[PDB]
């Protein structure tokens, strides 16, 4: 497949399809859905790697929303990228202002 | 022995650790119902739509309380007050 | 609109012995759809600014540099260019 | 709106890291939550009505939240 030739798990054909169907331009360049698919897989791998770390740092074998939230909020760059995003059931990063803690 | 700060700090740790919805579900549904039916009398909701609103609403409130907390600390207080909510909202753009 | 099987494939590459919950898979699907729309959106803006009719990998690349912070953008751009190269190499 | 109880609001403030809460906070919070829900529900209904439906879906709410800059993950 197109994704095989690109070394990707993400569907290059679907991405191409959605580029055309979402009325983004009259035309799609042959490289465009490969590039975009690669970027989406990269970002997915980043979150899944850090979330799996948080899951395993808690001796858990499964990623749940909490772990995606922990991973995103502890990575300065993902946290900025998903700054206006609510991860349902993610809770908050545990953190108490230092002034509220016993001296 | 009283020690309220100890009690408060334990409550912060408890609820920062959990992810459950903190407003009970039936009161929330009934609040959504009143606002919605005040818009259009015959309007209905899917339950997943009520729960989407409840996730969104609680997340909004928690984040607001974080900012509100910082406003009170700014004024050298540990007790949050309406004017702290008001300041946070004013600077947030609401 | 649903990428779950692909998300799962990526999960098994970075964390072979870790599973994912269905609620968490929904989050990931929203994420991929969100990031897709942001990039495709900016790529469409770019092409329109430049009176061009076509979204090419250049517009995806520029959109990535504009939208992703810092080192995410550099690694994204590197992953994207590399994939376009492998796509048509022996 | 009084259904949103004081314990419930206090718990929300706990998760937000709040150590002490004035008694005046609860009514204030109820006003703020009402404004938030009115604003989101109004846009949700607009999406629902545009589609000539009479039941608001999670997708309608997801769209309403996006139009207000509050992207929500987990309901698409």
């Amino acid at each position: 497949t197109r994704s095989s030739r690109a070394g990707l798990q993400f569907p290059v054909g679907r991405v191409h399809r959605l580029l055309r169907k979402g009325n983004y331009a009259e035309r799609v360049g042959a490289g465009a859905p490969v590039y975009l698919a690669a970027v989406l897989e990269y970002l997915t791998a980043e979150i899944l790697e850090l979330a799996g770390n948080a899951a395993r740092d808690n001796k858990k074998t499964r990623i749940i929303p909490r772990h995606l939230q922990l991973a995103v909020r502890n990575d300065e760059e993902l946290n900025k990228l998903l700054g206006r995003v609510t991860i349902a059931q993610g809770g908050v990063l545990p953190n108490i202002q230092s002034v509220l803690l016993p001296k | 022995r009283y020690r309220p700060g100890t009690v408060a700090l334990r409550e912060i740790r408890r609820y920062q650790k959990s992810t459950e919805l903190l407003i009970r579900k039936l009161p929330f549904q009934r609040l959504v119902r009143e606002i919605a039916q005040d818009f259009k009398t015959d309007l209905r909701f899917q339950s997943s739509a009520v729960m989407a609103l409840q996730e969104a609403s609680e997340a909004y409130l928690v984040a607001l309380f974080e900012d509100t907390n910082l406003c009170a600390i700014h004024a050298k207080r540990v007790t949050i007050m309406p004017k702290d909510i008001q300041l946070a909202r004013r600077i947030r753009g609401e | 609109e649903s990428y779950a099987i692909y998300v799962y494939k990526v999960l098994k590459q970075v964390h072979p012995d870790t599973g994912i919950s269905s609620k968490a898979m929904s989050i990931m699907n929203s994420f991929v759809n969100d990031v897709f729309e942001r990039i495709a959106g900016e790529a469409s803006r770019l092409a329109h600014y430049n009176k061009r009719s076509t979204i090419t990998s250049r517009e995806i690349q520029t959109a990535v540099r504009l939208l992703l912070p810092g080192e995410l953008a550099k690694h994204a751009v590197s992953e994207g260019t590399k994939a376009v190269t492998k796509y048509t190499s022996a | 709106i009084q259904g949103i109880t004081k314990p419930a609001i206090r718990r929300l403030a706990r998760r937000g890291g709040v150590k002490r809460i004035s008694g005046l906070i609860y009514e204030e919070t109820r006003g703020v939550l009402k404004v938030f829900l009115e604003n989101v529900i109004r846009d949700a209904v607009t999406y629902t009505e545009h589609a000539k439906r009479k039941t608001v879906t999670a997708m309608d709410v997801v769209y309403a939240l996006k139009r207000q800059g509050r992207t929500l993950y987990g309901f698409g």
Partner: peptide
């Protein structure tokens, strides 16, 4: 019991045979 009241006439579920449950589950292919 801390659940929504699905007998509320204000709720119109699409499935509307099954009750929604809150539990997460393993996502598998």
């Amino acid at each position: 019991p801390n659940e929504y009241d699905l007998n509320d006439s204000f709720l119109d579920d699409e499935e509307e045979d099954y009750e929604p449950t809150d539990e997460d589950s393993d996502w598998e292919p």
